[PDB]
């Protein structure tokens, strides 16, 4: 009853980006591992550097197998992302709680009917505040983007007075198409 593994709906790949000024952005970009069970997810997560312990300029990306963590990818080019910008913390370490929660929404297929629209999530650790975002395939699918948004905010425990925004990738490349 707990000896058998619990398979996820999708196979996910964890990517890591090291901001080493030696080779194109799409270079320091590396795939760390893939997993398709709850057990294997934890075996990876419990054994990799916490986001709060990553140095400035690095990112972690959890994306569905077959979707590279880049705007240009076929599943991201017409899509966008729900973006949360966070303050840096000399203590607290809340960045880890937010990222893990995000990971749980992705692997647990928390977006029901619209989990297929989800492409992945990215956490950027930067000197001026960190960022967490959930990428989706079509920035046009209003119902899907919007549902994913509401569920996510709730899951992050964000209050009614806060609101978060969704920006198209084509826009981030060149405001929010949605807000929840």
């Amino acid at each position: 009853e707990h000896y058998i593994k619990h398979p996820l709906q999708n196979r996910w790949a964890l990517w890591f980006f090291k901001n080493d000024k030696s080779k194109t952005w799409q270079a320091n970009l590396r795939l760390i591992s893939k997993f398709d069970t709850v057990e294997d997810f934890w075996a990876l997560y419990n054994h990799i550097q916490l986001s709060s312990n990553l140095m400035p300029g690095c990112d972690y990306s959890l994306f569905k197998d077959g979707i590279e963590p880049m705007w240009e990818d076929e599943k991201n080019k017409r899509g966008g992302r729900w973006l949360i910008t966070l303050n840096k913390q000399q203590r607290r370490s809340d960045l880890d709680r937010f990222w893990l929660e995000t990971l749980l929404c992705l692997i647990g297929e928390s977006f029901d009917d619209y989990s297929d629209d989800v492409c992945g999530a990215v956490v950027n650790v930067r000197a001026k505040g960190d960022k967490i975002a959930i990428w989706t395939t079509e920035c046009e699918n209003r119902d899907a983007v919007t549902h994913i948004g509401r569920v996510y905010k709730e899951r992050l425990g964000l209050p009614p007075k806060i609101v978060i925004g969704y920006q198209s990738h084509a826009d981030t490349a060149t405001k929010n198409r949605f807000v929840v």
């Binding site: 707990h2 619990h6 398979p7 996820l8 709906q9 709850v38 057990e39 997810f41 934890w42 997560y45 419990n46 929660e101 749980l104 692997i107 647990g108 297929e109 928390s110 029901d112 989990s115 899951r155």
Partner: peptide, 14 residues
């Protein structure tokens, strides 16, 4: 195959 947050967390340290 969906999974509740609480369910997923029960597997982190077993």
């Amino acid at each position: 195959k969906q999974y509740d947050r609480e369910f997923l967390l029960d597997f982190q340290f077993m």
